[PDB]
Structure 1
Amino acid sequence: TCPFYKKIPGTGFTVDAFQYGVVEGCTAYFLTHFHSDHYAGLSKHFTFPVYCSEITGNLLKNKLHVQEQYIHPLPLDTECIVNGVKVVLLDANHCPGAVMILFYLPNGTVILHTGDFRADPSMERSLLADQKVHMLYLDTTYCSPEYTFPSQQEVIRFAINTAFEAVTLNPHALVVCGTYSIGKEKVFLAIADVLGSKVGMSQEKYKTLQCLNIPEINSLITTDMCSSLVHLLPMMQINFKGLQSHLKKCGGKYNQILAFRPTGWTHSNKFTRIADVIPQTKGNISIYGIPYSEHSSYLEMKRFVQWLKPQKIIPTVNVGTWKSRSTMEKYFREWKLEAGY
């Protein structure tokens, strides 16, 4: 059955609720972003209205084959009316096409659903700033003070500098980047840009990236693996066996692999700095795990919530255990008291 935290009170709406069959009294289904835990259940046989961003709509049509007559894309930062309720889609700073949703209830209640997000001070100057928000449905993935990570900018500088050094020392080294979903495209695009190369990948991945409205994408990506010295592979293949196998398939064009896994967090963050990250190495293969997050750190989340000052907070992640629920509630109370309420 559909959990309470995917239901929007006083409306016919659900959010990211496609795996529960037909939901009782749901007149419109919202999808915040194209990640499988959120879209699970959608297909060509879905015949209810789906509301989403333009990019999410492109992916629904082309990857899942949802019929166009049931896809309702909305522009960002624009007041729209859906089944008689005013809504706004805001950029979530997660993966391409990911949104937060503002709902203005007929009775005057205002609700923000963050979907998945990485909180940023730039959000403090969107349409959020223009009215009080009463209820917040919050992405609490990393809601604990141990979750510190660097900026995306610092992590990308590290990856660019590491790749440029390696390939300048050895022109016969291949760079490989792991992927298993949309998001974190900057990792492989910034590396390819510093090496003067296109990124090579499967036909299926190339199709996915063509759905994203990235400027000048025909200029950065390719299915011609032979022309490219940055290759994308499934995340499952980023290990010594998988990479040894790939190197054999390149026909003696390359004699070394430098590979990146762009993981969310790793307990190395609790001890170590970004400058101090080191690879796992075996023979002519090195694997770097880099802390590229598309979710809020604890401090970023805290700042957003103390700025917004909602009346009620409803977590949407880590809700399955009493210990996690209790821990999150205690942090919310701390944040409230520190702000003076």
Structure 2
Amino acid sequence: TCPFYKKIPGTGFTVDAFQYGVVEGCTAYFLTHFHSDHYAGLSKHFTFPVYCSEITGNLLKNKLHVQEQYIHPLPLDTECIVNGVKVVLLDANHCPGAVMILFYLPNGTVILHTGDFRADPSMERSLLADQKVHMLYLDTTYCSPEYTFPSQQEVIRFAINTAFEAVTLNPHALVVCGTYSIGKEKVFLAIADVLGSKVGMSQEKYKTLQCLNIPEINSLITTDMCSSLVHLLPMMQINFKGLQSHLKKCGGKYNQILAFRPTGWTHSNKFTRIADVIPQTKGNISIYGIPYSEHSSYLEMKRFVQWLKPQKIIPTVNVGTWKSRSTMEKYFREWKLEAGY
């Protein structure tokens, strides 16, 4: 049964609620983004209207085979009427195609559902600037002050400079980047661009990337692994055993691997600056864990909420324990006392 924090009151709508069967009272199912915890349950047999971005609808049709007649893609930044209710989709600064959803209820209440997001000051100049929001359904993934990480730009600078140095020292080094979902494409695209290479990958991952409307993509990725010196592998293979095995397969073209695992936060963030990050090394294999986040840090989240000044906050992440819920509620009250709303 569908939990309350996935239901939008005063509507027929649910958000990211495909794993509960037929939800009583639901006339339209919204999907914020194409990550498995959120789409869990969708398939070619789904027969209710799904509302989403264009990119998400490309993935639904080509990866999950949802039939076209049930996919309802909406443009961003554009007032649309769905089953009698005005909605807007906003860029969430998460993975490709990820949105936040503004719902203008018939009674005058305005609700923002962030989906998954990485808050940014650029959101203070979107269509949110123009009216009051009563209720916020908030991505609270990193809602505690221990969760710090650098800007995405600092992380990519570190990655590019690290890969360019290694490969210029040793033109026979291969670079490998881990992936297990969409998101974080800048990591492997920025490294391939500094090296003058396309990114090589499996047919299944190429297919996924071809749904993402990235400009000039045909110039940047390939299934011909032999032509590429940046390879994408499953995240599970980014370990010494898996990388040794891969290097065997390359037929003596290479004699070293430099590998990247884009994680979110890890506790090595509480001690070490990005500039000071070092790899784990075994022989001719080195593995860097880099803190590339597509969710808000604590400080980014706090800034957004103190700017928006909602009347009520409903967390959508870390909701399963009383300790998590009590921690989050204490920070919400702090923020509100500090800012004065």
Q: TM-score, normalised by structure 2?
A: 1.00
Report the CA distance between 1:273 and its aligned residue.
Answer: 0.3
- d(CA) in 2 for partners of 1:212, 1:260: 22
Instruction: Report the 3-state secondary structure (helix = DSSP H, G, I; strand = E; otherwise coil) of the residue aligned with 1:153.
Output: helix
Summarize deviations over 1:283-323 as a string: whole Å, max 9, x none.
00000000000000000000000000000000000000000
- d(CA) in 2 for partners of 1:266, 1:97: 26
Report the CA distance between 1:167 and its aligned residue.
Answer: 0.1
Report the CA distance between 1:117 and its aligned residue.
Answer: 0.1
Report the CA distance between 1:63 and its aligned residue.
Answer: 0.1
- d(CA) in 1 for partners of 2:340, 2:109: 23
- d(CA) in 1 for partners of 2:4, 2:244: 47
Report the CA distance between 1:231 and its aligned residue.
Answer: 0.0
* Equivalence for 1:58: 58
Give 5+ residue unaligned stretches, structure 2. Answer: none
Summarize deviations over 1:48-81 as a string: whole Å, max 9, x none.
0000000000000000000000000000000000
Summarize deviations over 1:126-145 as a string: whole Å, max 9, x none.
00010000000000000000
Give 5+ residue unaligned stretches, structure 1. Answer: none
Instruction: Report the 3-state secondary structure (helix = DSSP H, G, I; strand = E; otherwise coil) of the residue aligned with 1:271.
Output: coil
Instruction: Report the 3-state secondary structure (helix = DSSP H, G, I; strand = E; otherwise coil) of the residue aligned with 1:290.
Output: strand
- d(CA) in 1 for partners of 2:325, 2:212: 35
- d(CA) in 2 for partners of 1:272, 1:333: 31
Instruction: Report the 3-state secondary structure (helix = DSSP H, G, I; strand = E; otherwise coil) of the residue aligned with 1:94.
Output: coil
Report the CA distance between 1:340 and its aligned residue.
Answer: 1.6
* Equivalence for 1:272: 272
Instruction: Report the 3-state secondary structure (helix = DSSP H, G, I; strand = E; otherwise coil) of the residue aligned with 1:46.
Output: coil
Summarize deviations over 1:258-288 as a string: whole Å, max 9, x none.
0000000111110110000000000000000
Report the CA distance between 1:227 and its aligned residue.
Answer: 0.2
- d(CA) in 1 for partners of 2:268, 2:245: 29
Instruction: Report the 3-state secondary structure (helix = DSSP H, G, I; strand = E; otherwise coil) of the residue aligned with 2:141.
Output: coil
Report the CA distance between 1:179 and its aligned residue.
Answer: 0.1
Summarize deviations over 1:17-51 as a string: whole Å, max 9, x none.
00000000000000000000000000000000000
- d(CA) in 2 for partners of 1:199, 1:177: 10
Summarize deviations over 1:126-182 as a string: whole Å, max 9, x none.
000100000000000000000000000000000000000000000000000000000
- d(CA) in 2 for partners of 1:290, 1:265: 9
- d(CA) in 2 for partners of 1:67, 1:38: 19
Instruction: Report the 3-state secondary structure (helix = DSSP H, G, I; strand = E; otherwise coil) of the residue aligned with 1:42.
Output: coil
Aligned pairs for 1:1-341 within 5 A: 1-341=1-341
- d(CA) in 2 for partners of 1:162, 1:72: 43
Instruction: Report the 3-state secondary structure (helix = DSSP H, G, I; strand = E; otherwise coil) of the residue aligned with 1:300.
Output: helix
Percent identity, aligned pairs only? 100
Q: Quote the RMSD (CA, aligned, Å).
A: 0.3
Summarize deviations over 1:185-211 as a string: whole Å, max 9, x none.
000000000000000000000000000
Report the CA distance between 1:248 and its aligned residue.
Answer: 0.1
Runs of 4+ in 1 over 3 A off after TM superposition: none
Summarize deviations over 1:218-247 as a string: whole Å, max 9, x none.
000000000000000000000000000000
- d(CA) in 1 for partners of 2:233, 2:77: 35
- d(CA) in 2 for partners of 1:61, 1:69: 10
Report the CA distance between 1:90 and its aligned residue.
Answer: 0.1
- d(CA) in 1 for partners of 2:266, 2:238: 16
Summarize deviations over 1:67-124 as a string: whole Å, max 9, x none.
0000000000000000000000000000000000000000000000000000000000
- d(CA) in 2 for partners of 1:252, 1:107: 68
- d(CA) in 1 for partners of 2:253, 2:271: 39
- d(CA) in 1 for partners of 2:268, 2:132: 39
Instruction: Report the 3-state secondary structure (helix = DSSP H, G, I; strand = E; otherwise coil) of the residue aligned with 1:287.
Output: strand
